Amino acid sequence: KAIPKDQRATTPYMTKYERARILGTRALQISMNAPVFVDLEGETDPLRIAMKELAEKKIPLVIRRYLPDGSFEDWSVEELIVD
Amino acid sequence: YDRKVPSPTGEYVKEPEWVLETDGVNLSEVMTVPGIDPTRIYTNSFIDIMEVLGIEAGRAALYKEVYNVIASDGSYVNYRHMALLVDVMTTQGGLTSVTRHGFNRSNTGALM
Amino acid sequence: QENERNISRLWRAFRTVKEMVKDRGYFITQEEVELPLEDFKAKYCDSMGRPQRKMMSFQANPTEESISKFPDMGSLWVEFCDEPSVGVKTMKTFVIHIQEKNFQTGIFVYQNNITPSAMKLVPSIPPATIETFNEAALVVNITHHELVPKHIRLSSDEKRELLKRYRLKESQLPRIQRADPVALYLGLKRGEVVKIIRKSETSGRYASYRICM
Amino acid sequence: RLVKALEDIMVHYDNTTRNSLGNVIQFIYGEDGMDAAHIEKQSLDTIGGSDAAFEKRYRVDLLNTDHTLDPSLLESGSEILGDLKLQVLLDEEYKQLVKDRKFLREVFVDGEANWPLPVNIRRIIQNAQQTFHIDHTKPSDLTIKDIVLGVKDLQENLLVLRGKNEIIQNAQRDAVTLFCCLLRSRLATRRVLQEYRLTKQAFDWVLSNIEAQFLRSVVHPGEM
Numbered sequence: 001k002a003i004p005k006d007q008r009a010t011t012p013y014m015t016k017y018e019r020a021r022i023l024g025t026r027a028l029q030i031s032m033n034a035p036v037f038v039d040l041e042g043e044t045d046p047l048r049i050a051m052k053e054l055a056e057k058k059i060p061l062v063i064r065r066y067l068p069d070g071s072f073e074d075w076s077v078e079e080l081i082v083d
Numbered sequence: 084y085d086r087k088v089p090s091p092t093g094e095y096v097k098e099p100e101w102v103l104e105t106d107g108v109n110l111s112e113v114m115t116v117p118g119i120d121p122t123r124i125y126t127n128s129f130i131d132i133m134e135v136l137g138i139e140a141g142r143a144a145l146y147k148e149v150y151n152v153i154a155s156d157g158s159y160v161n162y163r164h165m166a167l168l169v170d171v172m173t174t175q176g177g178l179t180s181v182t183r184h185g186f187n188r189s190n191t192g193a194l195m
Numbered sequence: 196q197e198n199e200r201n202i203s204r205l206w207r208a209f210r211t212v213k214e215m216v217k218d219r220g221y222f223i224t225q226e227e228v229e230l231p232l233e234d235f236k237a238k239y240c241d242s243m244g245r246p247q248r249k250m251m252s253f254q255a256n257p258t259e260e261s262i263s264k265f266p267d268m269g270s271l272w273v274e275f276c277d278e279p280s281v282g283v284k285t286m287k288t289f290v291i292h293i294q295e296k297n298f299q300t301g302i303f304v305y306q307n308n309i310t311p312s313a314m315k316l317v318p319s320i321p322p323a324t325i326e327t328f329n330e331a332a333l334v335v336n337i338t339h340h341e342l343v344p345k346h347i348r349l350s351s352d353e354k355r356e357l358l359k360r361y362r363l364k365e366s367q368l369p370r371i372q373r374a375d376p377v378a379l380y381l382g383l384k385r386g387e388v389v390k391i392i393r394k395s396e397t398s399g400r401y402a403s404y405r406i407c408m
Numbered sequence: 409r410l411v412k413a414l415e416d417i418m419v420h421y422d423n424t425t426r427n428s429l430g431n432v433i434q435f436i437y438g439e440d441g442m443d444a445a446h447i448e449k450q451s452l453d454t455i456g457g458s459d460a461a462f463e464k465r466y467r468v469d470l471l472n473t474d475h476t477l478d479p480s481l482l483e484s485g486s487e488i489l490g491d492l493k494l495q496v497l498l499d500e501e502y503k504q505l506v507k508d509r510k511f512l513r514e515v516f517v518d519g520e521a522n523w524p525l526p527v528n529i530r531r532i533i534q535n536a537q538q539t540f541h542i543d544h545t546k547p548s549d550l551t552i553k554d555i556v557l558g559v560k561d562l563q564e565n566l567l568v569l570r571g572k573n574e575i576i577q578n579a580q581r582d583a584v585t586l587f588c589c590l591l592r593s594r595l596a597t598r599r600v601l602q603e604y605r606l607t608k609q610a611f612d613w614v615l616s617n618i619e620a621q622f623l624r625s626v627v628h629p630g631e632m
Contacts, residue, residue, distance in 0.1 A: 009570045010421050015628045068420045068430065069362040087519045093459030095519035114335055117203065121335040132342070137377040139391060140342040161447070161524070162397050163438035167425065170433050171414065176372045176408065181413045191429060195416065360575050367430050394515050396523070398440045399586040402579065 001071055008073050010065055014080040018063055019054070022077055026050040026059050054082065110135050133178055142173045202246055204334055206235050209251060211336045212273065212304070215380055218338065220261030221271055248275035264350055269299030275330075281305045286313035294320055300382065301325045304333065326382055337376055344393035348381055349404075354388045357404060371405040383407045421629045423569055440583055441568045442526050443627040450528070452521040453593040454505060455512045466505050468552070468597050470495040481601045483547040494552035498597065501556055505596075508589040515586075525587060526625035529594045532617045533604060540610040548605050552597055558615060559595045563588050565619050568626055591618065 014022075027050035030036065036049060037058040043049050053059045054077075062076040085097040105113075110131045114121055126132050129148050133141030146169045153160050172179050179185055213228045240246045255271035262268060274289060286309070293301045303325060317325045337343055349357070358365070368388065371378060383389065388406045395401040416428040423441050425434040438444075457465070467475035470489050479485025488494060516523075536542065566587065569580045600606050606614065 009572070011570060011626075011629065013623070013626075015630065017628070017630050065421050068422060068424075068426065087517075089513065089519075093457065093462060115204070115331065117200075122339050123341060135376070136337055136340055136343060137375045138371055139344055139377070139393070140340065143342045161438075161444050163442075163444055166397075166439060167417070167434060167437075168414065171417070174369045174431060174433055176370045181409055186413065191416070357575065360573055361424075361432075361435075363430075363432065367426075367432060369432070395439050396515065397438065397586075398436075398583050399511065399515050399589075400582040401439045402582060403435070 003067075003071055003073050008075065010073055010075065012075070012079075012081055014077065014082050018077075018080070019082065022059060022061060022063075023047065023050045023054060026053060026061070057082075130178065138173065138176065141178060142169060145169050145172065145178070198244055202236060202240065202244075203232065205246055205248075205330070206232050207335070208304075208330055208333045209235065211333045212302075214336050214338075215333070216255050216271065216273065216302075218380070219255075219271070219382060220257055220265070220268065221255035222258045223255065248277050251275050267299075271300050271302065272296060272298045273302045273304075275304045276306060279307045281309040281313060283310055283312045283316070286310075286316060290316065290319065290325070293323065293325070299323055302328065304328050304330055306330050324382075324384075326379070328379070332376075338380065343377070344391055346377060346381060347390045347392070348383065349388045349390060357388060365406060368404060368406040370408055372408055378407060418632050419627065419629050423627075423629065436568075436579065436583060437627050441627055442625055443631070446526050446621075446625040447524045448526070448528050449522055450525040450590065452512060452523065452590060454509045454589060455516070455519075456521045462509070465598055466502050466596055468498050470498070478602070481548065481605070482551070483549055484551065485547075488552060491552075497552055497556045501592070501597070505592060508592060511585075512589065525590060527587075527618055527621045529591075529618065532614050532621075533606075535617075536606060536610045536614050537604065539613070540607060542605055542607065542610060544605070546605050548601055549608055550601065550606065550611060554608070555595070555597050555600055555611070558611065559592060562595075562615050562619060563591065566622055587622075 027046040030049050031046040036053070037060070038049075038053050038056055040049065040052070043052065050059075057078045059077050062074050063080070065073045065075060067073070084102040085099050087095040088098050090096040108126060108128055108131060110124070110126050113119075114124060114135070126144070127148075129141060129144040132144040146165060149165055149169065153165070172181065175189070210228060210230075213223055217223045217228060236246075239248075239251050252272075252274040255273060257265075257268050257270065272293060274292075276285060278285060281303075286303070289301070289303055300323065305327065306329075309327065314327065317327070338346075357363075365386065371383075371389070373379075373383065373385075381389070385407055388404055391403040391405060393401050393403065417425065417433060418427075419425050419437050423436060424432060425437045426432045463475065468477050469475045470477060470491055477485065477488060479489060482488065566584050567580070568583060569576050571577070571580075600611065
């Protein structure tokens with residue numbers, strides 16, 4: 001039932017699955033004409049643009065980590081420490 | 084059988100001792116006989132270890148049995164996988180068979 | 196001959212009884228458990244040489260820490276039997292004796308076998324229980340074996356704390372059968388959670404939690 | 409039979425291995441919380457060696473001449489000798505290593521010191537020596553309190569569970585005890601001041617690399 005921010009006791013590191021689905025969904029949105037928040041260096045492939053947004057944490061998403069008891073947490077990808 | 088036992092010089096030393104290999108099995112009777120260590124004894128049949136020495140001993144014995152075949156084949160498998168396998172077979176109490184009568188006779192969903 | 200061997204087996208079994216009662220949480224000193232064989236024969240054996248199990252029956256009192264942790268824990272009464280086949284009348288004397296002395300639990304040790312009527316006349320006085328153990332089964336303590344880790348009986352508050360921190364139901368814990376010689380050793384009941392401390396080879400000290408059937 | 413036997417078992421976002429129905433098989437995956445892709449065979453220096461070698465290595469005396477400290481190892485070696493506080497810290501570290509040796513004697517009764525563990529310390533030490541140009545006949549700027557307090561501050565940074573209750577910290581300490589014993593064995597004052605001759609930035613870099621690789625060796629939740 002939405003655990004508050006002071007009680008979030010999950011791993012602050014972004015896993016490979018979270019990075020994978022964030023890059024996949026973000027790249028899918030970029031392929032569907034989504035507003036890009038980072039200036040492009042001449043890229044054409046959507047996955048490279050998604051990784052470019054992840055490298056600067058400009059992806060506007062938040063992860064709803066489901067807990068085994070039915071609860072969940074909201075860890076934004078901007079505050080998640082990548083790698 | 085050589086037995087690695089600590090020396091008072093700080094490193095282990097192999098000290099051979101006479102050990103009795105046995106054909107056939109009867110754990111309970113043999114355990115009570117005076118003249119042996121009642122704190123040390125093994126059985127190749129983990130079922131008897133489960134019955135006599137309880138569930139935890141059954142667990143460790145099962146792990147030894149599995150690990151034995153692995154090391155006999157001349158292969159290495161990480162501790163994690165074998166530990167998980169052994170634990171699954173013991174989490175409902177006793178020993179649970181890996182059969183179609185060993186997890187299809189307990190609820191997991193009709194489809195599963 | 197056979198008499199001295201039976202005295203030795205009865206002495207090791209009696210030592211195992213003192214160790215088992217001591218592990219339950221009753222006050223028995225270390226020198227009381229480490230009593231030699233010559234003193235036991237010099238105490239509970241007549242001039243002829245036959246041991247007297249009726250004199251070996253004693254009382255156990257819980258420790259201060261056991262009362263502080265388990266306020267509902269009461270004293271114990273340990274009795275044996277000189278009859279090879281325990282009759283129903285002796286069991287009636289045991290049950291009536293427990294009811295007179297007002298003990299919470301009881302331990303009765305038999306030699307060979309007991310009549311089924313006596314085993315049926317055990318759950319007669321709630322919430323008191325009676326633990327029937329064999330003399331040939333208590334010869335060796337199973338907790339002193341290398342393949343048997345350490346078990347600690349938890350309380351109710353620690354059980355609710357465990358289920359609250361792990362967010363588990365009572366059925367989601369690994370279950371242990373009552374027929375376990377370890378559960379019979381500690382005298383576990385339905386709904387009691389025990390902790391198993393084992394020495395793993397990948398972490399050094401691994402802890403587990405089980406619950407009786 | 410093995411595939412259909414082990415299928416609906418995974419690790420949720422709580423570092424606890426449990427199936428789909430919620431039945432807990434293992435409270436911690438692999439009883440340590442480490443993936444099988446970052447574990448390497450390591451050697452335990454606490455049990456290895458004789459008693460004379462143990463006391464010859466893990467004793468750095470300052471008020472006694474039995475296992476005194478060679479002042480040419482560090483720059484301020486002339487001022488470290490005669491200090492009671494650093495000698496007390498060396499007593500606490502030595503007693504801790506002795507307790508770890510008795511614990512390893514109770515855990516491993518076969519006498520083997522090679523066991524698979526995460527984080528390779530030797531490669532970090534060699535990368536530090538080859539990175540900071542650490543050669544022989546070079547006095548170090550470290551002291552006893554820097555290495556002792558550095559290790560003690562690194563032992564608290566190792567985290568696998570993100571909780572703060574009693575049982576969570578107990579499982580964390582019981583799941584980090586062996587690795588902390590390995591770090592206390594490989595990170596001794598004599599082993600760094602005598603053999604490694606590490607400096608300040610090199611030692612701190614080794615600490616950051618050990619903590620970092622320990623944070624990368626954690627198993628990810630959600631893996632089948």
